[PDB]
């Protein structure tokens with residue numbers, strides 16, 4: 001390749017347009033990069049141990065309603 | 067989303083294994099160090115409350131084998 | 132000032148010796164003025180002696196940076212090659228400019244940031260929701276409230292309020308300060324500021340040795356933590372304390388959970404017999420408010436130690452301030468220097484704690500006395516923890532009941548296993564509970580400096596270390612908005628904190644070595660070094676060399 005050790009430059013140059021699009025989309029959406037509130041844990045689903053076999057798919061719901 | 071999403075895990079797993087081998091992680095901070103690394107590098111939080119009875123590093127194939 | 136301007140020196144060995152002698156001949160006076168103006172700051176006795184300290188500190192800073200610039204521009208290969216210890220020590224000490232390597236604007240910003248951090252820590256207040264005309268400060272309101280009130284809600288309110296108030300406005304200043312310090316000490320020659328701080332200890336394997344040392348001390352802290360957690364679970368119930376998980380970092384002792392002394396109220400092993408905490412016997416014997424220092428001096432003289440110069444009893448105040456708004460209370464012993472004399476400046480009371488502190492500061496004065504013959508740069512005693520270790524081994528030897536009985540403060544020795552266990556646990560709630568701390572704090576600061584902790588991972592790494600080593604969970608859910616490391620006093624005021632850990636480790640080693648040397652091969656509690664001239668001679672021999680040789684060699688000697 002012409003370089004001794006590893007480098008992230010070819011990878012960064014590879015994903016340049018998708019990185020630019022992601023940056024612009026994140027700026028538009030008003031998001032915060034990274035994860036503050038690191039000690040956040042999601043709650044258990046209501047009636048978790050025996051409530052797993054319940055369909056919660058949007059496409060299935062729309063098809064059933066129609 | 068196939069590769070960039072993977073890079074932290076590759077940086078993470080062998081870092082945890084190095085810590086365990088070097089003695090910095092005794093057999094009482096296995097899950098603690100593992101999930102600290104998972105939250106620090108990958109931004110992933112455990113869904114259920116995991117404590118020291120669990121060993122959530124043997125779930126990966128490359129740790130036992 | 133022509134005295135502050137360096138002269139001429141050559142690259143020859145005689146030239147380096149001339150540099151060392153000239154540094155003596157100038158820095159002696161410079162440190163005289165600095166320490167005199169330092170004494171002048173007794174809580175603004177006249178409100179102008181404070182600005183005299185400020186001007187003398189600037190006066191010393193300019194001279195130090197000038198001498199260091201001369202040494203850097205003239206003495207690189209001498210630092211690289213020459214081998215005897217004293218000249219290497221002198222040249223290394225003069226070579227490090229510290230914050231003097233930055234440009235004028237950057238250095239001014241650095242000093243302004245340091246003063247900013249110190250001030251914003253000092254004047255941080257906690258106000259109740261009703262916004263009463265009074266607002267709590269850290270001293271003496273918040274500390275007393277946290278060390279006295281056994282109310283979960285009040286303790287939590289005080290803890291969270293102080294941590295928020297003293298940490299949230301301290302984040303950007305600390306980030307900029309870390310950047311500036313890293314730049315300055317990278318220009319100095321070290322890879323980072325943390326490397327500079329570790330370089331005082333002269334050990335390539337300092338971190339590994341420290342980790343092994345803490346791994347050796349783990350079971351003691353584990354048992355103590357389990358016992359205190361059981362007591363707290365009995366007191367505060369089961370909802371707020373988990374019998375398996377950690378304990379919240381407000382329910383014990385101080386605000387930062389470094390010392391657990393205030394827990395000893397509810398965790399006593401044997402409460403049937405009274406503990407040895409007596410002050411009436413001192414007053415019945417008719418002690419002075421100053422004769423405690425005199426009996427400490429005669430105790431030193433007994434084992435042929437501390438030939439105290441008379442200037443202390445004429446120019447050193449050992450009492451509370453009778454007149455003038457002098458110091459309220461601190462734990463320092465400023466030296467007159469002069470190449471002649473020193474001084475104690477402390478508070479006097481009737482409790483045994485004051486007597487132990489008096490013995491500690493007399494030991495510090497003894498440390499100052501022994502290395503006077505050494506050059507100016509060889510004033511610090513080897514390892515920066517040596518000062519505290521030497522000043523605390525004597526206090527350990529003094530606080531024993533046998534010492535008090537043999538020196539008249541106690542009618543007779545209380546030889547009971549229950550009393551020994553009570554005293555051991557009382558002293559193990561500050562000399563063991565602090566051991567995870569210090570190590571924890573300086574590991575966090577090393578990580579922050581080295582770049583392993585970016586400004587977006589301050590609280591995360593801090594609380595990971597707190598739960599890992601100390602093992603205390605935050606009662607309120609924190610996040611990266613908070614800066615909980617800035618609540619500690621030593622984080623804004625830039626001061627290393629591993630010295631206390633090293634000294635706590637070292638004082639027991641010195642105590643054991645002296646006890647084995649003293650010829651008393653028994654339990655280590657009642658092992659006072661009274662009336663043992665050989666132990667005094669050995670301690671004097673070790674105390675003679677201050678930074679003259681690496682601390683490892685002195686430790687091997689002792």
Ligand SMILES: *[C@@H]1O[C@H](CO)[C@@H](O[C@@H]2O[C@H](CO)[C@@H](O[C@@H]3O[C@H](CO)[C@@H](O)[C@H](O)[C@@H]3O)[C@H](O)[C@H]2NC(C)=O)[C@H](O)[C@H]1NC(C)=O
Nearest residue numbers: 151152153154155156157159160469470471504505506507
């Ligand atoms: C470090 O610097 C100080 C200050 O320059 C030096 O202290 C001074 O050392 C000289 C000898 O080099 C002392 O003079 C001697 O004092 C006694 C008087 O009874 C006696 O031994 C000799 O007759 C001689 O006069 C001097 O008192 C002392 N202090 C001052 C204020 O000048 C010190 O020597 C330097 N250290 C090194 C290692 O160079």
Ligand SMILES: *[C@@H]1O[C@H](CO)[C@@H](O[C@@H]2O[C@H](CO)[C@@H](O[C@@H]3O[C@H](CO)[C@@H](O)[C@H](O)[C@@H]3O)[C@H](O)[C@H]2NC(C)=O)[C@H](O)[C@H]1NC(C)=O
Nearest residue numbers: 239240241242243244245246247248250251252300301304
């Ligand atoms: C940290 O230190 C900086 C200095 O590097 C402090 O900056 C200070 O900023 C205030 C305003 O925020 C300045 O007050 C001045 O007052 C008058 C108002 O008419 C006028 O001269 C200026 O427009 C300005 O507002 C102040 O001079 C400036 N410097 C100092 C030394 O205080 C900053 O306040 C410090 N941080 C904190 C949290 O206090």
Ligand SMILES: *[C@@H]1O[C@H](CO)[C@@H](O[C@@H]2O[C@H](CO)[C@@H](O)[C@H](O)[C@H]2NC(C)=O)[C@H](O)[C@H]1NC(C)=O
Nearest residue numbers: 054055056057058059060061062063064065066
């Ligand atoms: C979710 O609700 C929205 C309305 O808030 C739905 O949008 C419309 O839904 C109706 C049926 O209720 C469809 O006929 C329309 O075509 C939908 N509008 C559009 C613009 O698509 C939406 O379909 C619902 N989605 C799901 C997944 O349930």
Ligand SMILES: *[C@@H]1O[C@H](CO)[C@@H](O[C@@H]2O[C@H](CO)[C@@H](O)[C@H](O)[C@H]2NC(C)=O)[C@H](O)[C@H]1NC(C)=O
Nearest residue numbers: 416417418419420421422423425444445449450
């Ligand atoms: C320290 O103690 C001595 C006595 O040991 C003090 O001398 C005072 O003089 C009277 C004379 O009858 C003694 O009985 C008292 O005990 C002393 N008065 C006090 C302590 O108030 C001596 O003044 C003391 N030294 C000081 C205060 O520097």
Ligand SMILES: *[C@@H]1O[C@H](CO)[C@@H](O[C@@H]2O[C@H](CO)[C@@H](O)[C@H](O)[C@H]2NC(C)=O)[C@H](O)[C@H]1NC(C)=O
Nearest residue numbers: 532533544545546547548551652653654657658
């Ligand atoms: C306080 O009590 C302990 C026992 O709990 C004493 O231990 C002594 O130990 C030595 C050997 O190390 C024996 O020869 C003694 O007989 C023990 N003394 C007893 C049992 O009374 C310890 O020495 C006592 N401390 C003091 C200062 O006397």
Ligand SMILES: *[C@@H]1O[C@H](CO)[C@@H](O[C@@H]2O[C@H](CO)[C@@H](O)[C@H](O)[C@H]2NC(C)=O)[C@H](O)[C@H]1NC(C)=O
Nearest residue numbers: 032035036037038295299608609610611612613
């Ligand atoms: C970190 O947690 C703190 C404490 O809950 C959050 O601070 C509160 O934020 C809300 C929403 O912005 C405000 O209404 C409150 O006034 C804040 N309270 C205090 C005491 O500051 C903070 O927002 C959290 N930060 C992040 C990045 O999630």
Ligand SMILES: *[C@@H]1O[C@H](CO)[C@@H](O)[C@H](O)[C@H]1NC(C)=O
Nearest residue numbers: 136137138139140141201205
């Ligand atoms: C020695 O250095 C000083 C620095 O102040 C300088 O003034 C002087 O000229 C120099 N002398 C010689 C002989 O190099």
